[PDB]
Amino acid sequence: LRVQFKRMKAAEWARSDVILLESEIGFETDTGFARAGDGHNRFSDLGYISPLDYNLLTNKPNIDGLATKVETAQKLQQKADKETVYTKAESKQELDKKLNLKGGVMTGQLKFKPAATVAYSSSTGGAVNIDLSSTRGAGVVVYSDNDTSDGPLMSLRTGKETFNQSALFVDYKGTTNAVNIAMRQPTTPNFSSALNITSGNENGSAMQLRGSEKALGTLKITHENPSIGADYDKNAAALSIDIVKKTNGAGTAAQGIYINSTSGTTGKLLRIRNLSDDKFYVKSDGGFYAKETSQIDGNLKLKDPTANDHAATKAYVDKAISELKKLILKKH
């Protein structure tokens, strides 16, 4: 037996009315495929003579090891997109523009404009607050070696006439000078001062000074000759005073030097010395002493003499002449 089977093309079977007997094989001549009867279904309704079920395969691939789009996308959604996030490099670029508390160099203007909780009082207030209690360096060090400039090293301004605090307050304890101003020897000379003060306030002294020295002056002024030439400074003075009218004023009645003792002093009110030797002085009662010959271009009013070294008055001279003129009138 060489066995052959009912056979025709798939599509021919597809519209055949032939019922294969149970187990009877039929062959699709154009596919090579066989199908077996069940005794009732038409060919197109039989299944193939062998399994077509994925689970029955061998050498399956590892499907359960493969990543699902859903599961992958859930995991991606937890990850940060490149575009919503700075790189380390861009991060560093940004931070390098910010000032470290450890310190740094400002190349632009640092403004303060406090919103003000209270900005406190004492040594815990201030927009800028510097405590050097544990350290040996300076607080605010401002300098310039520039040739010229348009603004000062430091400037303090108050704008409103009611302003009821100071521009600068110095509260000092220590063993050297609270405030020290050194204007040192010019090469190119200025016509100006170490400290210059002007006040247009008529109800207050331009400068007020109180001290309580045991053996010194409240203000001590020393003039030093700028030259080795004995008389170069002949127009100089330790203290110079001028008394002027207002521009377009009619004049002035201001005094030059006014000295008082409100509690009363027993010291000399004015004491003038040269080489530490008294030369002139006004005692606490207003009597003066002068060491040398003196001149008045005018008269001197004074009391009649009682001691030999007293200046005589015209009254005293005249009376002594008149006395002698009488007495001598012994011509009866």
Next chain:
Amino acid sequence: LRVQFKRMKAAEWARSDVILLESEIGFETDTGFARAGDGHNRFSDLGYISPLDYNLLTNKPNIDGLATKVETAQKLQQKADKETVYTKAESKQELDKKLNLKGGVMTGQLKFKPAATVAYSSSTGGAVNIDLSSTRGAGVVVYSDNDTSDGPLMSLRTGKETFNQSALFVDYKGTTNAVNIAMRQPTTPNFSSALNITSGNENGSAMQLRGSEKALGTLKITHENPSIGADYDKNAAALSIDIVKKTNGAGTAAQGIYINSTSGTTGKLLRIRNLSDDKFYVKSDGGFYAKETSQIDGNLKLKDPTANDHAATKAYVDKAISELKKLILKKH
């Protein structure tokens, strides 16, 4: 021939003892599947009449193109999670709170509390160090246009009596005033000064001033009449001095003005002028000059006259009278 095959249900075959001959076909009536004998194995041990090997399929899907869970997870592990990382927006929000070195506006208090490497010495020390050597602007500009306040523009305090530096040190070179204080004309008047200084230190002058002017005063004071009225300022003075006891003190012996020359000067020690015309003066030897009639409510002790314009003493008058009284006693 319509050929039919040994046939029964899968599960019936499954416990049949029938051995299909080599190549003899048997049919599972409930699956449609055939199996062929090998001449020894029971049906359930034969394989199907056609391949069930994944590798022999056609139209395979691209399995090797698919991503494995393992490989995907390795790649995810290199990616940054959203939660461990700032967005650009959150990054910007944070940096916008930090101060640019280029500059910015502080709305709160900037404290310094240096840890101190040394904090240096000279023009490279300081918690705040400002070098204006290459620029034309001001260093520290502090101002207020507020009506009133609880603190000063600038405050300098030292707490310990040993403190051996200054609160403020000014070392100036230039062509204008090192330090300039302008208190300009009040609308609402203060009873205070441009500069006010108090010292309770008995071993040091409250203020010390040294200058070396060729032709000026070390201190120059000018009083200007605040009014056009010639005599409005009649109680004013360029210099006013008071000398007081301590509260509950017994008094004082302090002098008003003390002038000395420790090296000896040939200048006038006190020179008083009006309209640049000498009116009174004390020469370097203590002789004085007064331009006009003067008064002493008391006597004057002085030496016997030798020139015609010298004040006569009571001794000199008395001796001349006594001489004339003798001589005239020519009555034998």
Next chain:
Amino acid sequence: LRVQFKRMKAAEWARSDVILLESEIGFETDTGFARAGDGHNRFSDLGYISPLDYNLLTNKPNIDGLATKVETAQKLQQKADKETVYTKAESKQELDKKLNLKGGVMTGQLKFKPAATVAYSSSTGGAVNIDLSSTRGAGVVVYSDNDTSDGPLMSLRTGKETFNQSALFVDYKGTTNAVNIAMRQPTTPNFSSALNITSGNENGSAMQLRGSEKALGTLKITHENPSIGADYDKNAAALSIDIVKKTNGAGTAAQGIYINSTSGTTGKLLRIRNLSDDKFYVKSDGGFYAKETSQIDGNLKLKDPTANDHAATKAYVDKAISELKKLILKKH
């Protein structure tokens, strides 16, 4: 019929020249597989008797639900790598080192070195610019409670002799003192001052002061006895002046006190009081008054008396004697 088929091993078929008739089955004895003739192809060129097409399987797995390496990698490429990006923690660590505009504490040196757009002029210039116009706290608060130190609280230096701005400029409006210096009572005494000024400039006053008080001194100085002991301060003075030569100088001609009125004043040029009672004074014309007995160790040159209380001259005495001597020569 038990039907058996042409059969041999796969590899034997593989080189058989046998042509199966159309539909005639042949069996691979070592695989169990059948193939059916087409009437022309050799065995190795027939296909299996049943389908081997993936698309015809049942129980396919969801291949289209699986993620492709390509698609996964495209999605990964949008995600940021861990290594190119700061964590929140590292971000915070970096920002915590930067200064908040809200405020903070510097532990190191804040230098300024302005690049300078113009650094402006007035109350909008400055490397540090503090506006307290809306607030009640201090501007710059510098203090130290340290025992000793190597630098001052504040330092202002200018290096070039042309420098044409001030170190410190105070422009004040208000109702208290523009600048106030308090050196308060020492426990450990300093031999120094609240304010100390030195100038080596020979073309300018060390200090210049101008005021326009109605009824006060431009400078007011008060010395207060530091002790309750009436005469403890007997060597003290409100104002002390010294006049010295240059080191290795030949001497000096500088004056002590120089008083002038450039516009002419009607006030007393020098007025000395004790307990508010005039004791000595120099009037605007140079006439003086002294309240008590006075002494000159020398002569006094003055004009001939005209009133009874005028000091007599030697000329006047001599002429009156000579007159009486003549007249009395009535002895013919």
